[PDB]
Ligand binder design. Sequence first.
Ligand SMILES: [Cu+]
Ligand SMILES: [Cu+]
Ligand SMILES: [Cu+]
Ligand SMILES: [Zn+2]
Ligand SMILES: [Zn+2]
Lengths: 155, 155
Amino acid sequence: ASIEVKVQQLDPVNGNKDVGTVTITESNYGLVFTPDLQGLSAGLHGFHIHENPSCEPKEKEGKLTAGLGAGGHWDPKGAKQHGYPWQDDAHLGDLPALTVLHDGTATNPVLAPRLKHLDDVRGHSIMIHTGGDNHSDHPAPLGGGGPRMACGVIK
Amino acid sequence: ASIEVKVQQLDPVNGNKDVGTVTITESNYGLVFTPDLQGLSAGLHGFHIHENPSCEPKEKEGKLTAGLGAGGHWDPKGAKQHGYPWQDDAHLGDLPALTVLHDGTATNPVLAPRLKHLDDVRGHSIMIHTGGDNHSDHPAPLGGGGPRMACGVIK
Ligand SMILES: [Cu+]
Ligand SMILES: [Cu+]
Ligand SMILES: [Cu+]
Ligand SMILES: [Zn+2]
Ligand SMILES: [Zn+2]
Protein backbone atom coordinates (compact mmCIF):
# COMPACT_ATOMS: atom_id res chain seq x y z
CA ALA A 1 0.00 0.00 0.00
CA SER A 2 1.30 3.47 -0.92
CA ILE A 3 0.53 7.02 -1.91
CA GLU A 4 2.77 8.70 -4.52
CA VAL A 5 2.73 12.47 -4.04
CA LYS A 6 3.91 14.71 -6.85
CA VAL A 7 6.05 17.58 -5.49
CA GLN A 8 6.81 20.92 -7.05
CA GLN A 9 9.19 23.72 -6.15
CA LEU A 10 6.97 26.75 -5.76
CA ASP A 11 7.44 29.88 -7.79
CA PRO A 12 4.42 32.08 -8.44
CA VAL A 13 6.47 34.35 -10.74
CA ASN A 14 8.67 32.15 -12.93
CA GLY A 15 6.58 29.00 -12.68
CA ASN A 16 6.49 25.98 -10.43
CA LYS A 17 9.06 23.27 -11.19
CA ASP A 18 8.62 19.50 -10.96
CA VAL A 19 11.07 18.11 -8.43
CA GLY A 20 9.91 14.50 -7.99
CA THR A 21 7.84 12.56 -5.52
CA VAL A 22 7.35 11.61 -1.91
CA THR A 23 5.98 8.12 -1.52
CA ILE A 24 4.05 7.34 1.64
CA THR A 25 3.91 3.76 2.93
CA GLU A 26 2.76 2.02 6.04
CA SER A 27 5.23 0.42 8.48
CA ASN A 28 4.58 -1.39 11.76
CA TYR A 29 5.81 1.81 13.49
CA GLY A 30 3.83 4.42 11.48
CA LEU A 31 3.87 6.13 8.08
CA VAL A 32 7.13 6.28 6.15
CA PHE A 33 7.80 9.21 3.79
CA THR A 34 10.30 8.30 1.10
CA PRO A 35 11.50 11.17 -1.08
CA ASP A 36 12.76 10.89 -4.60
CA LEU A 37 13.46 14.55 -5.25
CA GLN A 38 15.92 16.66 -7.27
CA GLY A 39 16.55 20.33 -7.90
CA LEU A 40 16.01 21.61 -4.36
CA SER A 41 18.27 23.82 -2.31
CA ALA A 42 20.65 21.72 -0.23
CA GLY A 43 20.12 21.54 3.52
CA LEU A 44 17.92 20.20 6.29
CA HIS A 45 14.38 21.46 5.69
CA GLY A 46 11.21 21.60 7.72
CA PHE A 47 8.75 18.99 6.53
CA HIS A 48 5.12 18.94 7.59
CA ILE A 49 1.61 18.00 6.63
CA HIS A 50 -0.48 21.09 6.15
CA GLU A 51 -4.20 21.28 6.49
CA ASN A 52 -5.49 21.98 2.99
CA PRO A 53 -5.13 19.86 -0.15
CA SER A 54 -3.64 22.85 -1.90
CA CYS A 55 -0.18 24.13 -2.82
CA GLU A 56 -1.55 27.30 -4.46
CA PRO A 57 -0.12 30.71 -3.49
CA LYS A 58 -2.24 33.35 -1.83
CA GLU A 59 -2.07 37.14 -1.54
CA LYS A 60 -0.67 38.48 1.71
CA GLU A 61 0.37 42.10 2.28
CA GLY A 62 0.23 42.77 -1.48
CA LYS A 63 2.45 39.80 -2.44
CA LEU A 64 1.40 36.49 -4.06
CA THR A 65 3.06 34.21 -1.52
CA ALA A 66 4.17 30.70 -2.28
CA GLY A 67 2.18 27.81 -0.81
CA LEU A 68 -0.13 29.77 1.51
CA GLY A 69 -3.14 27.94 0.00
CA ALA A 70 -2.08 24.93 2.03
CA GLY A 71 -3.02 26.70 5.30
CA GLY A 72 -1.31 25.85 8.55
CA HIS A 73 0.24 22.79 10.13
CA TRP A 74 -2.31 19.94 10.15
CA ASP A 75 -3.60 19.87 13.75
CA PRO A 76 -6.77 17.78 13.93
CA LYS A 77 -6.31 17.06 17.62
CA GLY A 78 -5.97 20.77 18.46
CA ALA A 79 -2.49 20.59 20.07
CA LYS A 80 -2.01 24.24 18.98
CA GLN A 81 1.77 24.05 19.16
CA HIS A 82 4.60 22.84 17.01
CA GLY A 83 6.81 20.00 18.25
CA TYR A 84 8.53 16.72 17.65
CA PRO A 85 7.38 13.86 15.46
CA TRP A 86 7.25 11.71 18.60
CA GLN A 87 5.44 14.33 20.74
CA ASP A 88 1.83 13.63 21.37
CA ASP A 89 0.84 17.22 22.19
CA ALA A 90 2.29 18.59 18.92
CA HIS A 91 0.58 19.17 15.57
CA LEU A 92 -0.14 15.78 14.07
CA GLY A 93 1.42 17.02 10.84
CA ASP A 94 4.87 17.52 12.38
CA LEU A 95 7.21 15.18 10.51
CA PRO A 96 10.94 14.62 10.78
CA ALA A 97 12.96 17.16 8.85
CA LEU A 98 13.89 16.35 5.25
CA THR A 99 17.58 16.05 4.26
CA VAL A 100 18.35 17.50 0.85
CA LEU A 101 21.81 16.32 -0.14
CA HIS A 102 24.56 18.65 -1.31
CA ASP A 103 23.60 18.26 -5.00
CA GLY A 104 19.92 19.08 -4.48
CA THR A 105 18.60 15.53 -4.37
CA ALA A 106 16.71 13.86 -1.52
CA THR A 107 16.26 10.11 -0.98
CA ASN A 108 16.43 9.58 2.81
CA PRO A 109 13.13 8.29 4.20
CA VAL A 110 11.64 9.46 7.48
CA LEU A 111 9.09 7.90 9.87
CA ALA A 112 6.10 9.66 11.38
CA PRO A 113 5.25 7.37 14.34
CA ARG A 114 2.03 9.14 15.24
CA LEU A 115 0.52 8.59 11.75
CA LYS A 116 -0.75 5.06 11.40
CA HIS A 117 -2.82 4.63 8.22
CA LEU A 118 -2.49 5.98 4.69
CA ASP A 119 -6.06 7.18 4.54
CA ASP A 120 -5.40 9.49 7.52
CA VAL A 121 -3.23 11.87 5.43
CA ARG A 122 -5.39 11.95 2.29
CA GLY A 123 -6.90 15.37 1.51
CA HIS A 124 -3.99 17.31 2.97
CA SER A 125 -0.67 18.69 1.64
CA ILE A 126 2.99 17.99 2.32
CA MET A 127 5.25 21.01 2.65
CA ILE A 128 9.02 21.45 2.42
CA HIS A 129 10.22 24.72 3.94
CA THR A 130 13.18 26.90 3.12
CA GLY A 131 14.33 26.82 6.74
CA GLY A 132 14.90 23.95 9.17
CA ASP A 133 12.84 22.57 12.06
CA ASN A 134 13.95 22.68 15.72
CA HIS A 135 10.57 21.17 16.71
CA SER A 136 9.55 24.16 18.83
CA ASP A 137 7.82 27.49 18.44
CA HIS A 138 10.85 29.03 20.19
CA PRO A 139 12.82 30.93 19.30
CA ALA A 140 11.00 31.07 15.95
CA PRO A 141 7.44 30.03 15.17
CA LEU A 142 6.90 26.64 13.61
CA GLY A 143 10.41 25.38 14.10
CA GLY A 144 11.95 28.15 12.04
CA GLY A 145 10.68 26.68 8.80
CA GLY A 146 9.79 30.05 7.38
CA PRO A 147 8.80 30.23 3.73
CA ARG A 148 7.39 27.39 1.65
CA MET A 149 9.88 25.97 -0.82
CA ALA A 150 8.10 22.94 -2.27
CA CYS A 151 4.74 21.22 -1.88
CA GLY A 152 2.47 18.41 -2.96
CA VAL A 153 -1.14 17.48 -2.51
CA ILE A 154 -1.85 14.12 -0.88
CA LYS A 155 -4.75 12.52 -2.68
CA ALA B 1 15.98 10.00 32.00
CA SER B 2 18.89 10.07 29.59
CA ILE B 3 22.27 8.77 28.58
CA GLU B 4 24.90 11.32 27.46
CA VAL B 5 27.38 9.72 25.08
CA LYS B 6 30.72 11.41 24.42
CA VAL B 7 31.63 11.16 20.72
CA GLN B 8 35.04 11.46 19.12
CA GLN B 9 36.18 11.75 15.52
CA LEU B 10 38.48 8.78 15.08
CA ASP B 11 42.09 9.19 13.96
CA PRO B 12 44.58 6.51 15.02
CA VAL B 13 47.48 8.56 13.55
CA ASN B 14 46.96 12.21 14.49
CA GLY B 15 44.77 11.56 17.55
CA ASN B 16 41.02 11.35 18.15
CA LYS B 17 39.15 14.65 18.40
CA ASP B 18 36.27 15.55 20.71
CA VAL B 19 33.22 16.38 18.62
CA GLY B 20 30.44 16.61 21.21
CA THR B 21 27.69 14.37 22.42
CA VAL B 22 24.70 12.28 21.50
CA THR B 23 22.00 12.24 24.18
CA ILE B 24 19.70 9.28 24.30
CA THR B 25 16.19 9.75 25.77
CA GLU B 26 13.01 7.72 26.01
CA SER B 27 9.90 8.75 24.04
CA ASN B 28 6.48 7.08 23.87
CA TYR B 29 7.60 5.84 20.38
CA GLY B 30 11.11 4.60 21.20
CA LEU B 31 14.58 5.92 21.86
CA VAL B 32 15.51 9.38 20.63
CA PHE B 33 19.13 10.21 19.72
CA THR B 34 19.83 13.90 19.92
CA PRO B 35 23.22 15.00 18.61
CA ASP B 36 25.10 18.06 19.70
CA LEU B 37 28.12 17.65 17.48
CA GLN B 38 30.68 19.85 15.73
CA GLY B 39 33.70 19.42 13.52
CA LEU B 40 32.43 16.53 11.39
CA SER B 41 32.41 16.26 7.58
CA ALA B 42 29.12 17.62 6.19
CA GLY B 43 26.63 15.15 4.79
CA LEU B 44 24.17 12.39 5.58
CA HIS B 45 26.01 9.67 7.49
CA GLY B 46 25.25 6.13 8.49
CA PHE B 47 24.48 5.91 12.17
CA HIS B 48 24.25 2.58 14.02
CA ILE B 49 24.70 0.88 17.34
CA HIS B 50 27.60 -1.52 17.18
CA GLU B 51 28.07 -4.53 19.35
CA ASN B 52 31.09 -3.78 21.54
CA PRO B 53 31.46 -0.96 24.08
CA SER B 54 34.62 0.07 22.26
CA CYS B 55 35.67 2.71 19.73
CA GLU B 56 39.30 1.52 19.67
CA PRO B 57 41.02 0.83 16.34
CA LYS B 58 42.18 -2.63 15.35
CA GLU B 59 44.78 -3.96 12.92
CA LYS B 60 43.45 -5.30 9.66
CA GLU B 61 45.66 -6.14 6.68
CA GLY B 62 48.62 -4.34 8.28
CA LYS B 63 46.73 -1.11 8.99
CA LEU B 64 45.41 0.26 12.32
CA THR B 65 41.82 0.85 11.23
CA ALA B 66 39.55 3.34 12.92
CA GLY B 67 36.74 2.03 15.08
CA LEU B 68 37.05 -1.68 14.36
CA GLY B 69 37.09 -2.43 18.08
CA ALA B 70 33.38 -1.72 18.11
CA GLY B 71 32.70 -4.89 16.08
CA GLY B 72 29.71 -5.17 13.82
CA HIS B 73 26.17 -3.80 13.80
CA TRP B 74 24.40 -4.75 17.06
CA ASP B 75 22.18 -7.70 16.13
CA PRO B 76 20.98 -9.39 19.31
CA LYS B 77 17.95 -10.90 17.54
CA GLY B 78 20.13 -12.43 14.77
CA ALA B 79 18.46 -10.77 11.76
CA LYS B 80 21.78 -11.09 9.92
CA GLN B 81 20.94 -8.29 7.53
CA HIS B 82 21.07 -4.53 7.46
CA GLY B 83 17.84 -2.58 6.97
CA TYR B 84 15.52 0.18 8.01
CA PRO B 85 14.99 1.62 11.46
CA TRP B 86 11.37 0.47 11.21
CA GLN B 87 12.22 -3.02 9.86
CA ASP B 88 11.78 -5.82 12.32
CA ASP B 89 14.08 -8.28 10.51
CA ALA B 90 16.99 -5.83 10.33
CA HIS B 91 19.82 -5.38 12.82
CA LEU B 92 18.40 -3.87 16.00
CA GLY B 93 21.24 -1.33 15.92
CA ASP B 94 20.07 0.19 12.59
CA LEU B 95 19.25 3.82 13.34
CA PRO B 96 18.09 6.65 11.08
CA ALA B 97 20.96 8.33 9.28
CA LEU B 98 22.56 11.37 10.93
CA THR B 99 22.47 14.78 9.17
CA VAL B 100 25.65 16.76 9.56
CA LEU B 101 24.88 20.31 8.45
CA HIS B 102 27.02 22.18 5.96
CA ASP B 103 29.26 23.73 8.62
CA GLY B 104 30.05 20.39 10.28
CA THR B 105 27.56 20.60 13.15
CA ALA B 106 24.74 18.16 13.90
CA THR B 107 21.66 18.85 16.04
CA ASN B 108 18.76 17.01 14.33
CA PRO B 109 17.38 14.24 16.57
CA VAL B 110 16.31 10.86 15.23
CA LEU B 111 13.97 8.17 16.56
CA ALA B 112 14.72 4.45 16.74
CA PRO B 113 11.22 2.97 17.16
CA ARG B 114 12.43 -0.57 17.80
CA LEU B 115 14.48 0.49 20.81
CA LYS B 116 12.31 0.95 23.85
CA HIS B 117 14.41 1.31 27.03
CA LEU B 118 17.63 3.14 27.78
CA ASP B 119 19.10 0.13 29.55
CA ASP B 120 18.82 -1.86 26.29
CA VAL B 121 21.58 0.11 24.57
CA ARG B 122 24.01 0.25 27.51
CA GLY B 123 27.20 -1.70 26.92
CA HIS B 124 27.37 -1.00 23.23
CA SER B 125 28.74 1.75 20.97
CA ILE B 126 27.27 4.31 18.56
CA MET B 127 28.98 4.77 15.23
CA ILE B 128 28.89 7.55 12.64
CA HIS B 129 30.20 6.42 9.24
CA THR B 130 31.89 8.30 6.45
CA GLY B 131 29.30 7.13 3.93
CA GLY B 132 25.53 7.20 4.02
CA ASP B 133 22.90 4.51 4.69
CA ASN B 134 20.47 3.23 2.07
CA HIS B 135 19.15 0.71 4.64
CA SER B 136 20.16 -2.32 2.59
CA ASP B 137 23.12 -4.59 1.92
CA HIS B 138 22.66 -3.86 -1.84
CA PRO B 139 24.38 -2.53 -3.74
CA ALA B 140 26.91 -2.07 -0.95
CA PRO B 141 27.19 -3.86 2.35
CA LEU B 142 25.77 -2.24 5.47
CA GLY B 143 24.02 0.56 3.65
CA GLY B 144 27.16 1.91 2.07
CA GLY B 145 28.39 3.32 5.37
CA GLY B 146 31.94 2.26 4.75
CA PRO B 147 34.62 3.50 7.14
CA ARG B 148 34.07 4.67 10.69
CA MET B 149 34.28 8.43 11.13
CA ALA B 150 33.23 8.99 14.76
CA CYS B 151 32.18 6.86 17.72
CA GLY B 152 31.15 6.82 21.34
CA VAL B 153 30.67 4.17 23.99
CA ILE B 154 27.24 3.90 25.57
CA LYS B 155 27.55 3.57 29.33
CU1 LIG C 1 5.09 23.24 7.18
CU1 LIG D 1 -4.18 0.86 8.07
CU1 LIG E 1 27.73 1.27 11.81
ZN1 LIG F 1 3.84 21.93 13.42
ZN1 LIG G 1 22.87 -2.74 10.24
